[PDB]
Amino acid sequence: ELIKVPTIPHNLVLIQSDNGKHALIKEDLGQWPVETGISLVNQAGVFAVQLANKLGIDKPFVLDAGSNYFTDTSFIDTRKYCTDGLSPREIQKALNRQRAYYDRPELTISENKTLLSQSIIYPDADGNDVSIIFSGAMSHAIFTYAQSQWNKNIIKLDDYIREITLTVPKQYRPRRFKEIEHTHGYVYRELNQGSLLPLVDANLKESSSYYFKKLMSSISNVPVDARTLQSATAALAADTGQAVNRAQHVSMLTNRLTTANAPTVRAITVLTCMFKQFRIGMTYALDPNIMDVAAATCMLLFRPAQSISDEQYRYCLQTMAVFLTNTTYDIVNNDTIDVLKMKLRNQGWPFVERYNAVEIDMSVEPLRSPGQVGRYYNPFNIDPLTKKHVEDRLEEFINQVQVGRFRNASGNAVGTTLAAFLRACRDKTSANWRGYSVLVSRYRSLIPNELFESLRNISGEYNINPQDEHSFFFALAQINADDEFIGAIDKESAEYLDEYATLARDISNSLTLVKAAFGPLERTSGSIINHANNLNKVINHVFADKPLISETMLKILTIDGTTGKDGYRNWLDKLVGHNYPVYVEPVVNIMNFISARFVADSSYFGYTNEIMIMPNHINVPVDDRFGFRDSPFCTSLPRTIMGNDVRRISYNVFSMMEDIDDVISEGFILYDAYFNFSYDIMTTDGVTRLKEDILIVTDTGNDIKPIHFYIYFENRNDKKLRYESKMNVSYRLYIKTPACLLPLSDYMRAQHDYVSPSSSRVYIKDPAVVYTRS
Amino acid sequence: CMFKQFRIGMTYALDPNIMDVAAATCMLLFRPAQSISDEQYRYCLQTMAV
């Protein structure tokens, strides 16, 4: 949610001595420890996030500062005096104290009015409010850049509706918005599409198993009518000859008619007609019956050809050949599809071909698939235009089967039984195809186009028994769309969106982690050892406290059987060296900006690249603007002192030096390390000295003790402090002048402008454009 | 009837029952044709055809 920031963050602290002679304005952004030997950019990222939290930058925000103002009492002055930032009254007090010391007169009425009116809020042409306050340069740059990045996402209500208008079906009623929301409605949304392919391509079996199991749970509950099998069985008994004493093939088909597994087969049928390639299996008995011929014939005639594999097609053909032609599995094992087709057709069996299933275009654009169309197979290989099976000779084909002779030279026991059974199966499909086609349309609307063309059936867990295959078509039940079922799908539609959004974010985070955490792997054992240990640290870190990955993604990886840590570890391996494009996000840009300013500007945060140690009797140029006594701050570390270049010694070389006593007497500069320093400017006068010693000499090496300056202001005529400074501080430590310090006289440079959007804007938390019909 | 600008529209289920076909006929019969829109008229025809 967008958070309206009430006050502009400023980090200005005004320090003035007791006499008031000197005064300075300082950034107070906090000291941050730094470490040498490790890459600086990696550390700057950690401190960048902490800086954002301090400044109210991390979360999406809009400045609300157009009401923090007042108006002067004078009639002429109608300006809006701002309140944020450093108060101009503090500057007036500091300037007057400075004037008091020099015996100058106090600021006049005219000069007082000019100083107090510097902070103002004035309207902009676009309606925005520009607030000019006294704020620091570091805070101003970071705050304004953060404002720009988040504003890239806030868009007008009409613009958002236009982008999403192509994914709204006809069933749902339109939402009516208030006219204020139409004229002044702004919605904070991010509309970058994240591809689920990186997880699906890497983990195909697991992702396929998850979506199939979840979708089957919803489909298994679809209501159907309740019809007794006796009405259909009575016709089958009459068309053939059923005797309570004789044994025939019709008894075999009818005795094993089961409706117990109807919901599972019904869920199988939808999945075959809703995914692009959802292969199905069927294992018949070792000795085929008329059960398996009916099961094989029913599968070929009604299941889509895109869901029947070439090998499964051959096994179905072999099963028909074994029964009808009376040949063994061994004889037909080496026979191909063409030889099997010819043998079956010569015997008189014409049901030896697979039939493709037509594709029906979706009425609305699929979710998470910008600028694409969707298609799902019509069930039962029934052409919607003709309302017929795709094969137009089915009536003549069934008559041919009935006349022909199989399994016996004389008699029509086999032919009449199968022709009668296929007859009821054909009638059921022609009546119920419209009901099933509607069901497939709903569930196709729950998957993006990426999942449509990527998910595959590899585990083989979804297989149909021959008993289930033929009993489903004999006892096909129509579909009743109760109001509860419609509501059930609507709740599932919302859940899928939340799951798709969560998974995309998890994928995007993981892709970014791999690029920085790991590199390329070589064939050396050093690379293998280094990669294994480093990856263990990454996995251990991301799972401490709040796991980086969500519970939605962990479930996909955990289905196989792994604990969940191993699933992410396995996935992170295959992602190394990816070429997937990742869209840089506003939050990523903000952190990069702060990190870059951390490396570029180091005096703000309390560390410096180089320090200088010089004996007291040598005079160095130092800043005199602030007025400190024996100021340890320099404009820049001198290149030459007394006509000779100042020695620069690396910290590593300095530690191992055993002659340190000799080189100290001349002075030198340490430059190959990050030096963390702090100071406490005190108002009273005194001797400026470090809290601790400069260096500690051990047997192992020499190190620089922590640097804490005790800075005091300077009064020229004080002999006691002049003698003490010279004759009690043998050595001095100098650094570059911290950029956070700013003299009071140059206070106009602290003037900075912050913009705030118009107060007339309203924010729509729920930008949904439709209502459920119920 | 009082204001010509106002319009009448209904949304039907994905699989229409006899309720929706009966309501669609009633709207096309006992409601002004000026009020019913062209897109809504096509929607009513689709429900009947389905």
Residue A253 contacts residue A417 (beta carbons within 8 Å): yes
Six token digits for residue A708? 């804490």
Round to whole Å and give the CA distance between A410 and A209. 50
Six token digits for residue A582? 């990742």
Beta carbons of B11 and A435 less than 8 Å apart: no
Round to whole Å and give the CA distance between A631 and A688. 8
Q: How far is A441 from chain B (nearest CA, A)?
A: 10
Q: Output the CA–CA distances (angstroms, integers) from residue A728 to A612, A631, A689, A692, A754, in the order listed.
A: 19, 16, 9, 14, 49
Round to whole Å and give the CA distance between A598 and A45. 9
Conformation bin of residue A606: beta by default, left when phi > 0, alpha when psi is -120 to 50: left
Round to whole Å and give the CA distance between A120 and A83. 8
Query: Which residue of chain B is at minimal alpha-carbon distance from A170?
Result: B11
SS (H, E, C) A515-541: HHHCCCCCCCHHHHHHHHHHHHHHHHH
Round to whole Å and give the CA distance between A316 and A332. 12
Which is it for the CA torsion A404, A294, A476, A251, positive or negative? positive
Q: How far is A171 from chain B (nearest CA, A)?
A: 6
Residue A172: its chain B contacts at CB < 8 A?
Answer: 11
Nearest residue to A557 (alpha-carbon basis) of A577, A536, A543: A543
Beta carbons of A481 and B15 less than 8 Å apart: yes
Residue A750 contacts residue A132 (beta carbons within 8 Å): no
Query: Which residue of chain B is at minimal alpha-carbon distance from A479?
Result: B15
Checking DSSP bridges between strand A129-134 and strand A644-645, what pairing results, if any?
Answer: unpaired
Residue A79 contacts residue A131 (beta carbons within 8 Å): no
H-helix segments, A5-65: 40-55
Percent helix, strand and coil across chain B, each to the nearest 5? 50, 0, 50
Phi first, then psi: what are they for A133, rounded to 5°?
Answer: -135, 175
Residue located via tokens 């993006």: A448
Residue A454 contacts residue A275 (beta carbons within 8 Å): no
Residue A249 contacts residue A290 (beta carbons within 8 Å): yes
Residue A2 contacts residue A721 (beta carbons within 8 Å): no
Six token digits for residue A547? 């796991």
Interface test mutation site (partner B, options A360, A362, A442, A773, max chain B beta carbons within 10 A)? A773
SS (H, E, C) A722-752: HHHHHHHCCEEEEEECCCCEEECCCHHHHEE
Q: Output the CA–CA distances (angstroms, integers) from residue A704 to A42, A612, A696, A733, B48, in the order listed.
A: 24, 12, 6, 11, 89
Segment 422-451 of chain A within 8 Å of chain B by CB: 435, 438, 441-442
Residue A366 contacts residue A445 (beta carbons within 8 Å): yes
Residue A171: its chain B contacts at CB < 8 A?
Answer: 11-14
Round to whole Å and give the CA distance between A293 and A418. 8
Round to whole Å and give the CA distance between A242 and A387. 34
Count of A-B CB contacts under 8 Å = 20
Which is it for the CA torsion A551, A556, A559, A564, positive or negative? negative
Residue A69 contacts residue A83 (beta carbons within 8 Å): yes
Which DSSP string do the residues of A292-344 spell out, in sequence order? HHHHHHHHHHHS-GGGS-HHHHHHHHHHHHIIIII--HHHHHS--HHHHHHHH
Q: How far is CA A31 from the centre of its chain?
A: 32
Length of chain B: 50
**Which one-letter DSSP state was computed for residue B14?**
S
Helix (H) or strand (E) run with residue A416 in it: helix A413-444
Residue A470 contacts residue A294 (beta carbons within 8 Å): yes
Beta strand extents in A36-153 (DSSP E only): 61-63, 69-71, 80-82, 120-123, 129-134
Q: What are the b/e assignments for A608-632, b being 16+ CB within 10 Å?
A: bebbbbbeeeeebebbebbbbbbbb
In sequence order, what are the beta bridge partners of A186? A156, A763
What residue type is A68 in one-letter code? Answer: N
Which DSSP string do the residues of A236-304 spell out, in sequence order? HHHHTT--SSS--HHHHHHHT---TTHHHHHHHHHHHTTSS----B----SS--HHHHHHHHHHHHHS-
Beta carbons of A441 and B12 less than 8 Å apart: no
Residue A486: its chain B contacts at CB < 8 A?
Answer: 13-14
What residue type is A149 in one-letter code? Answer: Q
Round to whole Å and give the CA distance between A125 and A123. 7
Q: How far is A444 from chain B (nearest CA, A)?
A: 14
Round to whole Å and give the CA distance between A40 and A748. 34
Six token digits for residue A47? 């401190």
